[PDB]
Design a protein around this ligand. Structure first.
Ligand code: MG
Ligand code: ZN
Lengths: 7, 141, 170, 72, 54
RNA sequence: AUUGACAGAUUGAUAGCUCUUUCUCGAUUCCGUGGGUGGUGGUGCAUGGCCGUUCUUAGUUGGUGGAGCGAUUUGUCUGGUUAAUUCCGAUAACGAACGAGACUCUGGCAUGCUAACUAGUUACGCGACCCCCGAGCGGUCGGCGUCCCCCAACUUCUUAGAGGGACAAGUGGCGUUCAGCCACCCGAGAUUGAGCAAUAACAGGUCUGUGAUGCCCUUAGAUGUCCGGGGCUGCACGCGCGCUACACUGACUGGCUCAGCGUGUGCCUACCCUGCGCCGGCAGGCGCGGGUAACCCGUUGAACCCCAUUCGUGAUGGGGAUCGGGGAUUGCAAUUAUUCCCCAUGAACGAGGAAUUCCCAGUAAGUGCGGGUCAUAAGCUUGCGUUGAUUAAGUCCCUGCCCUUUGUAC
């Protein structure tokens, strides 16, 4: 939930 | 050819060997019982350090003229490690190479300058150039 | 003084004008002192005193001026006749922020109202002509604890390089 | 300079010395081709890098870093 | 008397080195021999010639 | 009325401060009564001055209009965007203003200008040499001079004055075709770092920064001033920032090649930077000089770094804590070792559980070296360098700030 990947 | 187009390490080694072969450089009484630098923890590892350092010193004097005791001590400074405390810088020693520059004076390759310091004589410059040519010839063949 | 370096000369000189500027602030409290400009010449330097009550500065045929040249000569290591002093008047008194302060100080010494004198010294500035002003008084007055209040109107910018030279503060 | 800095200073020196000579005295068609080859290989042969040392700022040993602090 | 009063050698003394306005013996500055406390120069810096351009 | 003193005893005092002895200056003192003094004593919960944090984010105030009986509010907003109520748009707001911004400080550039012996470059007439026929427009010199000179000019490199260049300008894409965001070419650089930084809230800290200060407090057995010694470092234990290393990319020995900011002989203040030469194993000492400074240190020949030898996984020359002896250093003085130089004893230290901090480009980090401190000095601090990479161009998952909707006797 840390914006690591890019439902 | 000049001394620039030859390897500095091999030129110093060749000049040190030439000084050993001649055996006319003045040798102080304290031969192998003193340290070359203040920062060192041990005596010099190999003998003929007097000849090798005199070989390098003559090369530094060739590049830059008018160099005295204060100039030389800046050049040969060493990384002084004081153990627990942060390490600092230590200048080169004084007395030992004063015997070296008296040795060069005895061999007639240095001359006192007009304002101070020692400057290369024709005899010293000629010797440094021919050994440089021999070094280049040896490297080529 | 034939062997003096520039860096220490200007360092002693900057504190030289500062020493006189502070001393004349302490001295001419009732003369409306604002500041001093120093002209330096090899022959004979001159120093000007900026104040509003120039008549009181003279006193009696320059009694205060003549006594001031003597103490400056005796103290600051200057020979006889090497330093001369003059008195000038502030061109725009209202825009000299020091002036409105030394009027307020003597109003506080008299015992005038805190708000009325702040608005009075305020109202004196736009009639002279100014873009903005802000006077703040903080501290204790006939009571406990210390209160700070401000009195500002007009365009009054605090932030930026222009505030360095467009703003005079005391 | 330094050691890597001085080597690159000398390397860029001879490259733009050849470019300047090939600009002023010989055909400019070859001046364009040698410049194009130099740019194709590495642009740093001609450009001076803008990046310089960044002044330290108080509160930490490095310019950007901070001196490690604890609440207790 | 004269051999005891102020008989302590005044030279080479830090406290005896005191600012010419504040007479304080902590945090003296002697760059160009300025004889000026750090905070006292803080307030007169714009007067002496020092301005925080950087 | 006083002040000072030799002599013998105490006291550490060659301190008439005291005890016996007497001498010397003379209205300047002394004794009581009022009354200022001084304080690095206390109060920062009296404070004035400042700095810091909420905050270095994006947030705050009139005139005229609109909503209200009114205190007041809209102006400052569903939405999109930016680091940013900045900007764009629906819109009762329009003009504005404060704060970002903008401005100011240092480095990024023309073969642009002005002109700089307190600097260099190219040559000029030399000398020292190197090969070699006398060779060659040969190759180096920071060795000579081109301010009493005709024995030449110029500023590219060393810096000091002024001007544009980088403004999302040009192409493409996303975007309510608007603000704005990204790829790209030419470009010294397509986000280069810093100072100031709106009102106000801190019972924020400083009375030990001033002859800035209120009040109280010891004032002649002073909490003043004067001297001396002792500790501010003590030591069982816990806490912060930090340095040294736990090794082989290592360390030792010898050689080789590069640095800039910058202080450098002082009113009271004696105390500066150092060069050259000699003596000494080393800190160090002696004689001779330059610099009040682009002129001397200094072409600041600094350190891992580049090369060659040794040790080779052994708490192993490395890690070097603690102790002894010898000597110079600085001042009056070094013991309760300022520090430094040589021989010495030579413990832990196999990268350390939780649990946190700082860091995105010349960054971190290594590694030094200046200035602040100083009689002598740094393991502190601010800066200047040389070497010098990956990680991400994202969110609020954990800890906190901002905005609105806003319960709320606060
Ligand atoms: Mg002080
Ligand atoms: Zn002072």
């Amino acid at each position: 939930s840390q914006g690591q990947c890019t439902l | 050819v000049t001394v620039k187009d030859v390897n500095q390490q091999e030129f110093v080694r060749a000049l040190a060997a030439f000084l050993k072969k001649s055996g006319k450089l003045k040798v102080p009484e304290w031969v192998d019982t003193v340290k070359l630098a203040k920062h060192k923890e041990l005596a010099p590892y190999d003998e003929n350090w007097f000849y090798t350092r005199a070989a390098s010193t003559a090369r530094h004097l060739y590049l830059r003229g008018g160099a005295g005791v204060g100039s030389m001590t800046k050049i040969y400074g060493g990384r002084q490690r004081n153990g627990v405390r942060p390490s600092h810088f230590s200048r080169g020693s004084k007395s030992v190479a004063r015997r070296v520059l008296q040795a060069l004076e005895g061999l007639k390759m240095v001359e006192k300058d007009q304002d101070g310091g020692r400057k290369l004589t024709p005899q010293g410059q000629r010797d440094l150039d021919r050994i440089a040519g021999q070094v280049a010839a040896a490297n080529k063949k | 003084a034939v062997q003096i370096s520039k860096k220490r000369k200007f360092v002693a000189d900057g504190i030289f004008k500062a020493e006189l500027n502070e001393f004349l602030t302490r001295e001419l409290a009732e003369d409306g002192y604002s500041g001093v400009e120093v002209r330096v010449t090899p022959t004979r330097t001159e120093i000007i005193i900026l104040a509003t009550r120039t008549q009181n500065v003279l006193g009696e045929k320059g009694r205060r001026i003549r006594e001031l040249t003597a103490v400056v000569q005796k103290r600051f290591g200057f020979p006889e006749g090497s330093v001369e002093l003059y008195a000038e008047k502030v061109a725009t008194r209202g825009l000299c922020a020091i002036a409105q302060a030394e009027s307020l100080r003597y109003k506080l010494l008299g015992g005038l109202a805190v708000r009325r004198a702040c608005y009075g010294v305020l109202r004196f500035i736009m009639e002279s002509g100014a873009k903005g002003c802000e006077v703040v008084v903080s501290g204790k007055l006939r009571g406990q604890r210390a209160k700070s209040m401000k009195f500002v109107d007009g365009l009054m910018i605090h932030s930026g390089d222009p505030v360095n030279y467009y703003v005079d503060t005391a | 300079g330094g050691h890597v800095a001085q080597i690159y200073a000398i390397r860029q020196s001879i490259s733009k010395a050849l470019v300047a000579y090939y600009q002023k005295y010989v055909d400019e068609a070859s001046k364009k081709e040698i410049k194009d080859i130099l740019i194709q290989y590495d642009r740093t042969l001609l450009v001076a890098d803008p990046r310089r040392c960044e002044s330290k700022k108080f509160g930490g040993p490095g310019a950007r870093a901070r001196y490690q602090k604890s609440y207790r | 008397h004269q051999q005891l009063y102020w008989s302590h050698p005044r030279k080479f003394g830090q406290g005896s080195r005191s600012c010419r306005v504040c007479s304080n013996r902590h945090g003296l500055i002697r760059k160009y021999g300025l004889n000026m406390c750090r905070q006292c120069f803080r307030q007169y810096a714009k007067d002496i010639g020092f301005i925080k351009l950087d």
